[PDB]
Symmetry: C2
Subunit: 546 residues, 2 copies
């Protein structure tokens, strides 16, 4: 069997079901074999960076059940993937990257030249620091096992991206078809700490939410009445609930941060407790609590926040080994969770009442109007992203998606293409004016493929998050996003008022379809709450619930 046909077969048999590409000579055999088999849907995009973001959104939107694929040619194709690869690496989402390479006999090998073949570039050397596995196939007999290995590595433990570099001659070669075809005492210790806490709280992180069994385990936590907060990456997958206080940290809800600083036991499930979660005083994190941290990765234990008790456990195993129903029922906790609900009621409010359009009002309207609609949100990077992270309260079949660790602007629009294809559901993008520019060209794909993606551009005529902290502001100069959308054949609307916003959103939900909204937000250049001056996480600005 032809090697490229074997690659197509292996991808489809291992749940790599959606791929994204910009073509080049060195991947024609792969693309052709994939399209012919027709089990993996391959979508053409205008920039391999866009392809990489779309591919990453496949595992994101399917909660790691299905993997994405990005294909690129050697040289500039491979170098164009890199931002996306790095996002998958820093947020631990699985994704497959295949680069086509020049013929093995055209490689420079060890010769002291910068390149030998046309458009030759070693992609492995570029991505070794940001992948779980990166290898260039040397002989056609390595291809099948190495691809199977790479896919297994992407998915396993702490997930992430993998890359195989495949010389064109190997793609065309024949392969052999026949050869193709925890301590119970630790668990108990944690239970006992939970049982005896007067004010327990979970911190749900990125390591928890995409691990098998998570939502069923959380249902049992709710049955026991234990409240919780989440990191940005945990928050992506958590439905709104009275026991869920929202995201913690610098931009987190005042209520979530209050809970963290007043709990007597904090159980941290797969969170790095990085500077965005803790602020500049990790010593002060959960100051009234004993902290338990569970993580698969020893290096992420005893790091910034030194937990009182640290356990190296993979979380899907933890969830199958520990039912929260084994925690004795405790009615002391009702007073605590009532206290937190009331804190949320009184502090989860509009802090932008003197702005022309409040971000809190916009996101409150999204929460309300989409209550019975299965859709996901994709966020870009900037103040706009944090407006969303704070205020989005996800309804039953809704997730939101962020570039958290890397924080790459330009993620959202192309990611929405992948999310829509793999999630088979409408998508709402929120992006800022700066971030919208980077992969604006992929609006063409949204139009071409008639995808039900609503793109909301929150235009504050500034690179807002850095402007607050010459190179971020141009005296009100801005691009015409409504006109850019229309130029790309996407129905577009200028949104000046809450009525216009609400009407446009209703229209989209009634008849999902390519739509772009340019929201005029010149006075909206900060987040409230926010954390300043090295302060504790329960001292967000504006001061005192400000």
């Amino acid at each position: 069997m032809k090697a490229s046909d074997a690659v197509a077969k292996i991808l489809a048999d291992n749940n790599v079901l959606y791929g994204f590409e910009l073509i080049g000579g060195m991947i024609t055999h792969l693309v052709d074999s994939i399209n012919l088999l027709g089990k993996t849907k391959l979508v053409s995009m205008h920039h391999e960076q866009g392809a990489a973001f779309a591919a990453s959104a496949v595992s994101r939107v399917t909660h790691h059940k299905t993997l994405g694929l990005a294909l690129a040619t050697s040289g500039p194709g491979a170098t164009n993937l890199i931002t996306g690869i790095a996002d998958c690496w820093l947020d631990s989402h699985p994704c497959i990257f295949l680069t086509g390479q020049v013929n093995t006999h055209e490689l420079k090998g060890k010769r002291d030249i910068r390149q030998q073949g046309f458009q030759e570039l070693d992609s492995v050397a570029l991505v070794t620091s940001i992948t779980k596995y990166a290898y260039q196939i040397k002989s056609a007999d390595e291809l099948v096992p190495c691809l199977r290995k790479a896919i297994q590595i992407a998915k396993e433990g702490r997930p992430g991206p993998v890359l195989l570099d495949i010389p064109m001659d190997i793609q065309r070669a024949d392969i052999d078809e026949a050869l193709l075809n925890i301590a119970m005492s630790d668990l108990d210790f944690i239970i006992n700490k939970l049982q005896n806490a007067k004010k327990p709280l979970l911190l749900i992180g990125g390591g928890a939410v995409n691990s098998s069994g998570f939502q069923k385990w959380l249902e049992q936590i709710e049955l026991r009445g234990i409240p919780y907060v989440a990191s940005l990456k945990g928050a992506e997958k958590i439905k709104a609930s009275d026991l869920y206080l929202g995201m913690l940290g610098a931009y987190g809800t005042r209520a979530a941060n209050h809970a963290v600083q007043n709990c007597d036991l904090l159980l941290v499930l797969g969170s790095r407790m990085d500077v965005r979660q803790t602020g500049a005083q990790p010593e002060d994190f959960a100051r009234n609590a004993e902290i338990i941290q569970i993580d698969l990765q020893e290096g992420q234990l005893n790091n910034r926040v030194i937990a009182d008790f640290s356990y190296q456990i993979e979380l899907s195993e933890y969830f199958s080994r520990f039912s929260p129903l084994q925690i004795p029922v405790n009615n002391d906790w009702s007073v605590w969770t009532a206290l937190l609900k009331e804190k949320f009621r009184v502090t989860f409010i509009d802090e932008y009442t003197t702005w022309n359009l409040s971000p809190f009002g916009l996101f409150t309207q999204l929460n309300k109007l989409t209550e019975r609609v299965a859709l996901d949100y994709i966020l870009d990077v900037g103040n706009n992203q944090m407006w969303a992270a704070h205020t989005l309260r996800l309804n039953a079949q809704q997730a939101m998606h962020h570039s958290g660790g890397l924080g790459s602007m330009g993620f959202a629009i192309p990611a929405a293409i992948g999310a829509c294809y793999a999630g088979k559901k409408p998508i709402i993008v929120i992006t800022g004016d700066g971030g919208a520019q980077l992969n604006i060209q992929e609006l063409d794909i949204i139009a071409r493929d008639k995808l039900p993606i609503l793109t909301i551009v929150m235009n504050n005529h500034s690179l807002g998050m850095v402007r607050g902290f010459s190179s971020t502001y141009w005296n009100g100069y801005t691009s015409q996003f409504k006109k850019i959308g229309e130029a790309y054949r996407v129905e577009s609307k200028t949104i000046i008022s809450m009525q216009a916003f609400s009407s446009a959103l209703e229209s989209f939900l009634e008849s999902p379809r390519p739509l772009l909204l340019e929201v005029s937000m010149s006075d909206a250049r900060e987040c409230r709450p926010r954390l300043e001056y090295g302060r504790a996480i329960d001292q967000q600005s504006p001061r005192h619930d400000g």
Copy 2:
């Protein structure tokens, strides 16, 4: 002195005079220090990839006399630079890259974690394989000497890109100001080469990328012309060579039929800084210049005795060669006039429109560019695809004109942002030619052209296809072109230009093209032309591979 202020001073004192950035928290101190000194002009762009291509165009448009700078924040800023870095690496153009990093005490170091600080990413590890020098500053006392070293390394020998990664705390540190202020050539080899030239009946030069940006090249070429010796060039050499009766054009797969004829009939080929890669020689390097003895001069031992094994190979840096060897010391051979007349005639009869049955001939479009811009100082920037090779073949540069290609890397999306750098540093109008595919990648930088009122004409040759690959798929996959052709579906480039506030025009005919060019040349200003070219999906001549370079198709 504040470290970032020192960095600003050092850049300006070493001819790093134009920079391009997308801001981030970890480069605010560097950007502020640069703007406050005001000797290096820093221009904001929408994508660090665009910034990188723009920065690269600074040395390109100034023939390596002035260097460009791209600044980016750690993490996605740095990863967005990479395509531009790789272009500078494979085409050997000098350029400085500075990335701002998290505070030294927030780095992950050797801890087994993927990151520690917010947006922390090791940029050095990403670019070590595609730079001459890449280093992360560890102590503020290293910054000044390392930056000076990096700039030196970028410029020297075979040029290229360098990167320094600078932690924010180091940018804010004090440095000591007072301290801030504080093989051989053989004559016998030169003579041997002179003797080979003087006794050749049919001499030819191959002028490569290593020659044309080396100091003294144009004055040396003037003397070659005085002696009446003809020459061809690689794509990278062709960037900088003025049209002349002795210059037969670019050689190779897409080169002129006349240039390829000259190479295969000369009796001595003197190769000056060319790799003689597959695009120059085709698939039979053993047949390259079959009637000639070949002399190759290169700085890099690894690029000698490589694909084409020269009869005589010399490791010499070309600026030294050009000073050590005046072509005036070659005696004229009396057979040369017959040979150069033969080649001029070959050029006359073969440098011809091969697309007479197309609605718009690329050859006609580029010959109109040659004619209409005859007395105008401007540069061309090309993207990647059939459109790029139409330009490489047919452009005949007038006196103060150059063209610029992504040759080794061949990165689509180069042209539009490169034009921004070229325009700023070259202080001259720029004409971009890009295909419909290539135009998309960094389309967002049209906004910068409009914002800054730059005299850049963007010509989109829209054949509704990813043409150069579409042909590959026709010939080898039985017409299965779903990833290069979408049944005529296309973007509206005229409307996209207008949306970005760039005056735009649809161009259907040669008259419209000519009128629009005349308008641009009369009043240079942001302008976009969408040229409708649905039937234009191949290059002629081309090499259908395996064949010798003098049997291009169509035959």
